[PDB]
């Protein structure tokens, strides 16, 4: 049997900018066992995103997640599983350990991952690494709270790529 339950029922999921890619192999693969659900190695990509960003985890889609964090190819075979985790990943003070890259020099290729923190230069003059005028850090943080509206609550997403 496969360690599927170790992917779905784990205590912690990774950031979207640095998503966790777990490979499943050499096992039976019993698939007999939500917010959304749509459909020889199997890869389970585990990460946390905002509710209204769930729609970007799909072929043909664009946006901050699809372009700068987790790019899913248009020629995609597999299932996307999402569920609300507002009871787990939210805190009254703001659960600010979930980060995503708001800006990037170029958009990502399929399954490309970049976890560098090089200062982003928006302007033409160098800032030498200092986040001053026209220079910004490339990984902001989601301030998840239990009282946010549905589209702003945290969702745990597992993408099963075949």
């Amino acid at each position, epitope marked *: *049997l496969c*360690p599927f339950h*170790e992917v779905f*029922n784990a*205590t*912690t999921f990774a950031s979207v900018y640095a998503w966790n890619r777990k490979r499943i192999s050499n096992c039976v693969a019993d698939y007999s066992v939500f917010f959304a659900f749509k459909c020889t190695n199997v890869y389970a990509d585990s990460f946390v995103i905002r509710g209204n960003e769930v729609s970007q985890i799909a072929p043909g889609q664009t946006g901050n997640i699809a372009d700068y964090n987790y790019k899913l190819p248009d020629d995609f075979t597999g299932c996307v599983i999402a569920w609300n985790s507002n*009871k787990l990943d939210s805190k009254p003070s703001g659960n600010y350990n979930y980060l995503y890259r708001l800006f990037r020099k170029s958009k990502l290729k399929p399954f490309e991952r970049d976890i560098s923190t090089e200062i982003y230069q928006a302007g033409n003059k160098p800032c030498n690494g200092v986040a001053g005028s026209n220079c910004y850090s490339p990984l902001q943080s989601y301030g998840f709270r239990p009282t946010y509206g549905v589209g702003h609550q945290p969702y745990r997403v597992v993408v099963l790529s075949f």
Partner: antibody
Amino acid sequence: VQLVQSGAEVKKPGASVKVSCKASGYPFTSYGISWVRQAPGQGLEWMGWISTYNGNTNYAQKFQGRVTMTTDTSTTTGYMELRRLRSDDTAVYYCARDYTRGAWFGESLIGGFDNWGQGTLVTV
Amino acid sequence: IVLTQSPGTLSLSPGERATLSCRASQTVSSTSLAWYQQKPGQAPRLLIYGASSRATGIPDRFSGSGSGTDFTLTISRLEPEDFAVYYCQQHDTSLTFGGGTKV
């Protein structure tokens, strides 16, 4: 799911004790096995955890250097050995099937100890 | 890390509501907390996992909740069969149990 442990034993200080735990009713290599000790009049004290797939272990520091855990997949039975028994180690030793750590990836899971054995009484 | 439970001896009449508290010395994730119930002469059983999810087979009169360093267990009606010793558990770091309380 059930776990079957051994009967009571009497040991002398400095001796070692080996406690078995026969498991059935579930896929053996899909779940880990943990051990918890309960001395008379006391609460529960965690000894350690062992994977049934990788063989990886996680022992509580206080029991490090004294406790060794192993499993035998072909007989779906777990074993624990406690060495250099002290007079203060008299207790009932429980075997439990855990859902607190993955047996394959080794990362923490949401759960607890689901199936407990009878408890093996060791006197010393 | 240490877990502390109170009251140590919550002995209440049957049919009444009963509550137990568990406090942590440090913040723990709700994903790594559980409650146990031990009957006299018996091995303990899992009552609640994931802070608030009832273990399979457990009656709906048992309801857990909490966050941060303050977690509780509520029994809506205390039955004759509920007079047991309760423990709180965490595995946010290592794995530890509280001292336990008797009902």
